[PDB]
Scaffold this motif. Sequence first.
Motif, mmCIF file in Angstrom:
data_model
loop_
_atom_site.group_PDB
_atom_site.id
_atom_site.type_symbol
_atom_site.label_atom_id
_atom_site.label_comp_id
_atom_site.label_asym_id
_atom_site.label_seq_id
_atom_site.Cartn_x
_atom_site.Cartn_y
_atom_site.Cartn_z
ATOM 1 N N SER A 909 75.386 1.570 56.222
ATOM 2 C CA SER A 909 76.162 2.157 57.292
ATOM 3 C C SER A 909 77.403 2.818 56.789
ATOM 4 O O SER A 909 77.920 2.505 55.714
ATOM 5 C CB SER A 909 76.526 1.149 58.366
ATOM 6 O OG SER A 909 77.425 0.200 57.895
ATOM 7 N N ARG A 942 77.579 5.216 61.830
ATOM 8 C CA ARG A 942 76.196 5.583 61.654
ATOM 9 C C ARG A 942 75.437 4.560 60.817
ATOM 10 O O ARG A 942 75.903 4.143 59.753
ATOM 11 C CB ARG A 942 76.164 6.967 61.039
ATOM 12 C CG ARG A 942 74.844 7.504 60.744
ATOM 13 C CD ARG A 942 74.903 8.939 60.269
ATOM 14 N NE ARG A 942 75.135 9.911 61.352
ATOM 15 C CZ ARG A 942 74.802 11.230 61.297
ATOM 16 N NH1 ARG A 942 74.216 11.730 60.222
ATOM 17 N NH2 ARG A 942 75.054 12.017 62.328
ATOM 18 N N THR A 943 74.254 4.166 61.283
ATOM 19 C CA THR A 943 73.449 3.179 60.563
ATOM 20 C C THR A 943 72.149 3.750 60.041
ATOM 21 O O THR A 943 71.391 4.418 60.743
ATOM 22 C CB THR A 943 73.167 1.922 61.415
ATOM 23 O OG1 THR A 943 74.402 1.296 61.766
ATOM 24 C CG2 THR A 943 72.323 0.918 60.618
ATOM 25 N N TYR A 944 71.875 3.456 58.793
ATOM 26 C CA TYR A 944 70.709 3.946 58.109
ATOM 27 C C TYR A 944 69.665 2.855 57.921
ATOM 28 O O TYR A 944 69.883 1.848 57.243
ATOM 29 C CB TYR A 944 71.142 4.479 56.764
ATOM 30 C CG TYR A 944 72.169 5.552 56.871
ATOM 31 C CD1 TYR A 944 73.510 5.208 56.826
ATOM 32 C CD2 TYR A 944 71.800 6.852 57.065
ATOM 33 C CE1 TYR A 944 74.466 6.161 56.941
ATOM 34 C CE2 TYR A 944 72.757 7.813 57.195
ATOM 35 C CZ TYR A 944 74.084 7.474 57.119
ATOM 36 O OH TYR A 944 75.038 8.434 57.219
ATOM 37 N N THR A 945 68.519 3.063 58.533
ATOM 38 C CA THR A 945 67.430 2.104 58.475
ATOM 39 C C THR A 945 66.423 2.563 57.454
ATOM 40 O O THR A 945 65.918 3.683 57.548
ATOM 41 C CB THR A 945 66.731 1.969 59.837
ATOM 42 O OG1 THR A 945 67.666 1.511 60.819
ATOM 43 C CG2 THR A 945 65.567 0.988 59.753
ATOM 44 N N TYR A 946 66.085 1.693 56.516
ATOM 45 C CA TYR A 946 65.128 2.050 55.481
ATOM 46 C C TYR A 946 63.910 1.170 55.598
ATOM 47 O O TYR A 946 64.009 0.021 56.035
ATOM 48 C CB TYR A 946 65.731 1.866 54.086
ATOM 49 C CG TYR A 946 66.941 2.714 53.827
ATOM 50 C CD1 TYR A 946 66.854 3.954 53.204
ATOM 51 C CD2 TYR A 946 68.161 2.231 54.227
ATOM 52 C CE1 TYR A 946 68.015 4.686 52.993
ATOM 53 C CE2 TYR A 946 69.278 2.940 54.021
ATOM 54 C CZ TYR A 946 69.239 4.161 53.408
ATOM 55 O OH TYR A 946 70.416 4.861 53.217
ATOM 56 N N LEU A 952 64.016 6.528 54.148
ATOM 57 C CA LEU A 952 64.891 6.431 55.303
ATOM 58 C C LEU A 952 64.033 6.680 56.522
ATOM 59 O O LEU A 952 63.276 7.652 56.548
ATOM 60 C CB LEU A 952 66.042 7.445 55.199
ATOM 61 C CG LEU A 952 67.091 7.467 56.355
ATOM 62 C CD1 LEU A 952 67.863 6.180 56.413
ATOM 63 C CD2 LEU A 952 68.061 8.627 56.108
ATOM 64 N N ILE A 955 68.249 7.121 61.603
ATOM 65 C CA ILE A 955 69.691 7.227 61.539
ATOM 66 C C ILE A 955 70.253 6.984 62.926
ATOM 67 O O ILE A 955 70.108 7.830 63.814
ATOM 68 C CB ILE A 955 70.156 8.596 61.053
ATOM 69 C CG1 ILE A 955 69.538 8.913 59.675
ATOM 70 C CG2 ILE A 955 71.629 8.568 60.972
ATOM 71 C CD1 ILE A 955 69.740 10.361 59.183
ATOM 72 N N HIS A 957 73.140 6.956 65.323
ATOM 73 C CA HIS A 957 74.476 7.516 65.371
ATOM 74 C C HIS A 957 75.168 7.188 66.672
ATOM 75 O O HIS A 957 74.570 7.300 67.751
ATOM 76 C CB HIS A 957 74.442 9.030 65.205
ATOM 77 C CG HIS A 957 75.797 9.594 65.069
ATOM 78 N ND1 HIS A 957 76.528 9.407 63.932
ATOM 79 C CD2 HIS A 957 76.575 10.344 65.889
ATOM 80 C CE1 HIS A 957 77.688 9.989 64.055
ATOM 81 N NE2 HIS A 957 77.748 10.575 65.210
ATOM 82 N N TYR A 1145 74.838 12.112 54.347
ATOM 83 C CA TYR A 1145 73.619 12.824 54.021
ATOM 84 C C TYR A 1145 73.737 14.326 54.192
ATOM 85 O O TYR A 1145 72.744 15.005 54.368
ATOM 86 C CB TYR A 1145 72.442 12.242 54.785
ATOM 87 C CG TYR A 1145 71.882 10.999 54.126
ATOM 88 C CD1 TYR A 1145 72.280 9.740 54.476
ATOM 89 C CD2 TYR A 1145 70.910 11.162 53.172
ATOM 90 C CE1 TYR A 1145 71.693 8.634 53.859
ATOM 91 C CE2 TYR A 1145 70.329 10.091 52.561
ATOM 92 C CZ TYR A 1145 70.704 8.833 52.894
ATOM 93 O OH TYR A 1145 70.095 7.774 52.281
ATOM 94 N N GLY A 1189 66.990 13.297 54.453
ATOM 95 C CA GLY A 1189 67.562 12.724 53.246
ATOM 96 C C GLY A 1189 66.531 12.617 52.125
ATOM 97 O O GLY A 1189 66.628 11.733 51.259
ATOM 98 N N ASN A 1211 68.944 6.837 47.391
ATOM 99 C CA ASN A 1211 69.561 6.523 48.681
ATOM 100 C C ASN A 1211 71.012 6.034 48.671
ATOM 101 O O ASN A 1211 71.414 5.247 49.543
ATOM 102 C CB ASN A 1211 68.738 5.510 49.410
ATOM 103 C CG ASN A 1211 67.350 5.943 49.742
ATOM 104 O OD1 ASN A 1211 67.042 7.105 50.053
ATOM 105 N ND2 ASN A 1211 66.484 4.977 49.704
#
Lengths: 1225, 84, 84
Positions: A909, A942-946, A952, A955, A957, A1145, A1189, A1211
């Motif tokens: 994040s 913002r959170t990035y889920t992988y 990725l 996202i 937001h 990103y 990304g 990442n």
Amino acid sequence: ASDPQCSQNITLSSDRFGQPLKQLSVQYPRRQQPAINLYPDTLPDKLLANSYDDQQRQLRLTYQQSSWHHLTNNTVRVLGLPDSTRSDIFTYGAENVPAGGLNLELLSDKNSLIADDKPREYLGQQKTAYTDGQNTTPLQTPTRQALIAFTETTVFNQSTLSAFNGSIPSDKLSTTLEQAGYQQTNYLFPRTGEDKVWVAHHGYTDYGTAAQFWRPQKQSNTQLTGKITLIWDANYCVVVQTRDAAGLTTSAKYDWRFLTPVQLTDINDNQHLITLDALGRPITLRFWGTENGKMTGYSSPEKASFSPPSDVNAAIELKKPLPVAQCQVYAPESWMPVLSQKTFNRLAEQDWQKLYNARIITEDGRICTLAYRRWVQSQKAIPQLISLLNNGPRLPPHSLTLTTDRYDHDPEQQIRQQVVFSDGFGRLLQAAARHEAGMARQRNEDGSLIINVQHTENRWAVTGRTEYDNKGQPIRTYQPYFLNDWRYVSNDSARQEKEAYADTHVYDPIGREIKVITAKGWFRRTLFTPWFTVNEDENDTAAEVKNIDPKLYQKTPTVSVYDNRGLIIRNIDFHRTTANGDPDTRITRHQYDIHGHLNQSIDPRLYEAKQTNNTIKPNFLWQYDLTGNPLCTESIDAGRTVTLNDIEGRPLLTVTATGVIQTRQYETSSLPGRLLSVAEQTPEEKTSRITERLIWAGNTEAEKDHNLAGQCVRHYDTAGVTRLESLSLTGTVLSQSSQLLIDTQEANWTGDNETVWQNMLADDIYTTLSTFDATGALLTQTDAKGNIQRLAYDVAGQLNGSWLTLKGQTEQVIIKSLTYSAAGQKLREEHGNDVITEYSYEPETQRLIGIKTRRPSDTKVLQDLRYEYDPVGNVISIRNDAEATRFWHNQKVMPENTYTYDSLYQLISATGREMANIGQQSHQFPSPALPSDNNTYTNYTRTYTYDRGGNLTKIQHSSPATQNNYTTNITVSNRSNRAVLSTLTEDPAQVDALFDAGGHQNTLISGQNLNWNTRGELQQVTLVKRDKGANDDREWYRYSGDGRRMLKINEQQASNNAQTQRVTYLPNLELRLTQNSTATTEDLQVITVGEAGRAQVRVLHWESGKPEDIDNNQLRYSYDNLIGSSQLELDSEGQIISEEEYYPYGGTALWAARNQTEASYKTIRYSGKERDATGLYYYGYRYYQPWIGRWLSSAPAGTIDGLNLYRMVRNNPVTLLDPDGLMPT
Amino acid sequence: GNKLVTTLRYARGAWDGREREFRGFGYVEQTDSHQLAQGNAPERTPPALTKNWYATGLPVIDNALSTEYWRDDQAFAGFSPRFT
Amino acid sequence: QADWLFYLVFDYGERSNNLKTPPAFSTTGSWLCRQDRFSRYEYGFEIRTRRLCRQVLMYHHLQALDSKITEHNGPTLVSRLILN
């Protein structure tokens, strides 16, 4: 105590001369898992669970067959002249190991594992072709001299030919292999029923005769290359004038006292000269030659006399106008104290001979160390001698080089002086370069370091300082610093001065480094077992040291698990997003083939899917020839590529992942064998085009005059032609030209007539010029129109200022001053717009931790950014303490931007300040806020889920102030790792349909398709799709041989905007022509200084259509943040023109400007690259896509890691950078 | 100021008797120790031991040496000399 | 000497080794008699040695190798060791 790896090498048979006729290399399997694990205390639960693999449990038996000639009789005895060898491998399981293991008697037995004449894999064979100096036909037996004509080796057999799959018909393959130089033949040590194999012949020598001593006369690397020759000197002991197949000839003269070349002449008749001292050490060099048929340099010694000093101090103090370069001073005896005139006068004048005869005083007055200590032990020591020796300020043995770059009439740049100190074991202790005036550490006369600094003109940048264990391993290292001297600083004071920065190196009993302790405050650590190596990073070891609580990284090492051949078969990662949860254990799987080469590789996501759905293929599949070349590679994400090379190893025929057929034309075997052309076609095309063509220089006078002999001088590619006009004596381009293909033309450089090529080419042709110093540093540069740069360097050779004049204009200062840290990092930069940037470093790592930019005339802080880091180096927070900016309404201070990482350093994040009206991130860049708008800016997160494959996927937001709440949803294939947004598809089954055969994304958005060329660069993007007879708005590109973009052509087809926006890229020059289909609207020439992403300054020159609110010759200064993203753009007086914040990103978080007219000329934004109108930004070799990304396409670069189609910087976009795409591997 | 020290111990040596010459030491034990300078590191590279056994040609010893070896019960059978 | 390009010379005291100039290839001096003279008898006759090497030196015939070197170049000293 248990489960070791074990190998055994058994000679099975040898001849009467002791040669190994038969030999077996035995690699034993992994031992059965015992009840007791002796090392689990520091392991994750899954390191034991995932320690075992099938590849660790095989018995591998590699068997050799061989033979040698022996010339043995009453007059000659020459033994051991090999002429044949064969290697094969037998494989058995763990269950096939005999009790007690293997040994020779078990093996010699009729029914043994290799005695039993069962099939085994053929790895290869080699043969020696012997000559007599007359024949090319190999002799059955060697001559006394064992002259070898050539070496034969196997490259292919049917298991390696099948590897070419469908890329070539079998009729064509047999033909191609012979065209490629391969010979199909028998086995040296054949077995019944085996097929013929193909060999390569290489290493060709034509030998002279006994009268010439048995020396070579002509040689060739391979059967297919041109032979080269040489002249033997009068005594056949020295090589004279080597000569190329092309007639390119070099020349040299030797110092016969040392049989060492001192005078060297190249193929362009340029010359280099060194001399040697009495001991044979090189002393100082001179050079000269011509650049445009005109002589330049220092010339021969008699034209400019110089005598190298023996004195290091004199050398340090020598004047700039020396006619030499790399002047040497040697002082290997500096460690050994020497008798002064004063102690001589007080003693030795009457007693010299007593001490001389006692072997204390040497011929040159030096004081013996060992003999002296004995003199003392014997109690014969004298107090004037005792004082002399005790007070001798000895330094480690050393030498000094005076590096110059001067020549002819120009002495203007100061000499770079570097003193290097070695230890008594021949290892390097340190070196220091004289630097510029500034602060430096002080020292006492006993070589005692003082951490406190004072200003001096006399300071040196001390670097690489290392302390050793006398085996040669570092035990301690020091960080670079400035010293107000060049003399070596005692190691004792360096250890004592705690405030100085240094690291400690901890080794095990083997000498492997197992713990690394750094000044930073943490350490690296590792564990070795026979099957795996555990790499503990700083965040894991920080748990003991006890920022994201290191508990998260507790026991999350990277572990390499090996097979029993020493290859890495598993890469085990531990993925946790919380310190209170369990790791998702991720194992990248790798399989090695019979030759030990990687056979295939797959990530954990597709691996598990493969287990329930076996139609899912690996990230990589591979095929190899018998020498280990990668004949074929295939990827579930990137398609199938097949290549057939020549004997040298260069491609002849290849088929790309996209099916494109390419072939290469080389010079024939009577010639050097250089590349002449490349032709290519898609499968749908039957006639290839010549897309690449090289016109090579020979050895003519004209070529020599311009230093072009042996060079390719006309390079035709996919964009047009590059032509060399002249090279410098330093090997740099002195002058070159370029001309591009006309929009409607294809790269099909056929025939033999330049007229045709000229008809294909546009009439826009230019030449650029460069001035260089004698080391090749750029001093000046003239662009395609006539704008001229001038550079200055400091004593260390670093840029220390810069100027630019536009054609017909007064020269402007771009950089008033520039200086660097001991580590060579920017320390301070003063710009021509009266803007000064200070650079804040962390001495422990010499890392830039902050950027401060001010406008001193009103001491206005324009920016002040600080960077906080975890133990590894992930930035965990960035804060800008400067005023928010004039475009903001009632806001002064921006919030701290935080970053959250998981156990794998993935960015989970991030937070920060964004424009209230920024909205949805997409491919369309927003309008700037203007200061009259009273714009509101708000906070965001913002959170990035992988996923489990490292892709990725989402996202998330948000911005509660405006409710800018949305999620970017990335749909990833459930069979592959290819991915697109939900915009194109939500279905993982259909994601693959949005990519071509080579893994290139087919579409950006519905209505905007991606037209790829044959190599992978994007040829055209549709921006507005229209139906029937309407013309589509499109942007298309032209790229060169290396993928460099030459053109960006944006074609607007609207009736009220039928307009072409033509941008031509020239070194340091942007030609931006905007015209309506009937008339020019704007014509702008942008000349730049420095590089984008490195605070590049640009000047905007108009020839036409300059806006009413724009000044001509306008200066634009870009101020980049730590990662090269352009934070601010300032005008010539230091005022802010515009600013931008970025999402990690590459998105746009905040966007504002003083004037939208001015804003329209800012193209360089995220990480130094241009924001292409398409939203897909070109970086060398690929395009960046902010909502994914994962760019648009893959690369052949990934190998050993088992990586997916593609992803951005593993990442971690706020810490790691890869602007050139060189990171994958 | 860093210094290394190595110390060797010898055992099981022998004289030929028949041709009257020194044959060698059946066992050579070599210890390497890193006496690194004070003020440098908090710890020294731990010391190492090399344990070498040699043929002397005197079978009494060459055979006896087999019991001086580090033991692993799960190991492969050891070696014996071969004459041809 | 004309038949060869390189020469390895052992000096037993025939020429000075404390010279700034090189020592002669061929000299008129004579070897020095050592204090520790000794003999061996295991071959049935006395073998007595009275000298030891004082220096080791290399010479190259430079005209034979090059061609433009002054005629007095056969005995050209390249390098030496002092054995004290």
